[PDB]
């Protein structure tokens, strides 16, 4: 099963946003092997921000 296959326009826009935030200065521990838990984390913090 797949909840996020990372190709749709708004998820790829979010992908491009955090790739740019990587490429600006620095972030924490690396990438290229993602996790759906991190996507749920991002969406839950977005839920809290909208709330």
């Amino acid at each position: 099963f797949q909840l996020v296959n990372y190709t749709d326009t708004i998820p790829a826009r979010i992908m491009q946003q955090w790739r740019t935030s990587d490429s600006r200065d620095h972030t924490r521990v690396d990438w290229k092997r993602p996790k759906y838990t991190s996507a749920l984390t991002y969406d839950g913090v977005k839920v809290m921000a909208e709330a």
Partner: single-chain antibody
Amino acid sequence: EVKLLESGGGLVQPGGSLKLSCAASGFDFSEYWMSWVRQAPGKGLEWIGEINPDSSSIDYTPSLKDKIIISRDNAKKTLYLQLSKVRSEDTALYYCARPRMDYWGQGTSVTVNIVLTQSPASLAVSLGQRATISCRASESVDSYGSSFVHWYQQKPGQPPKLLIFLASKLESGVPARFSGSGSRTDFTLTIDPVEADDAATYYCQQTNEDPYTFGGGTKLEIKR
């Protein structure tokens, strides 16, 4: 502004120890990560390692782990590199750099698949002109719409300053004399106007996936 100064370099005997310091000024070293990268004389660069601000995870290359130690001091804002049992391959120019706000320090000299091809190898351009340097990648370097490729210029005795970042943005401090463009297999850096101080070796490096490769080096000649 951001300033990094390396010290402790020079000459060292084979088999001994060596400690190089790198002081920072103008920024906060207690939040920004640091990195160290080596460069052989006449060859490409080689990333030695990276270290975080809290000194909790210091990463390095898998082939140079038994002879390199990276530490930092946030109170003094100074990084430290310790080498033990130096060999003939240790005669190189090391360079401490910020988290690549990408800025690289001067470094110190110690004397004891993605393929990026530059085009051309050497060219001579007059003053006040516009030069073009192309770069071809063997694999796709495009990820999430942004091309994560940096263009730097290193001179003889000078370190490679990060000129162009992400193939579409100019770095702070450098004037509006270098632009970048391209698409997904071919990158192109343009210089307009051409000054006499820009006579150095240009290098395009992409760090999209493993391994982080570097460019072949394209020297720029100023006509007279």
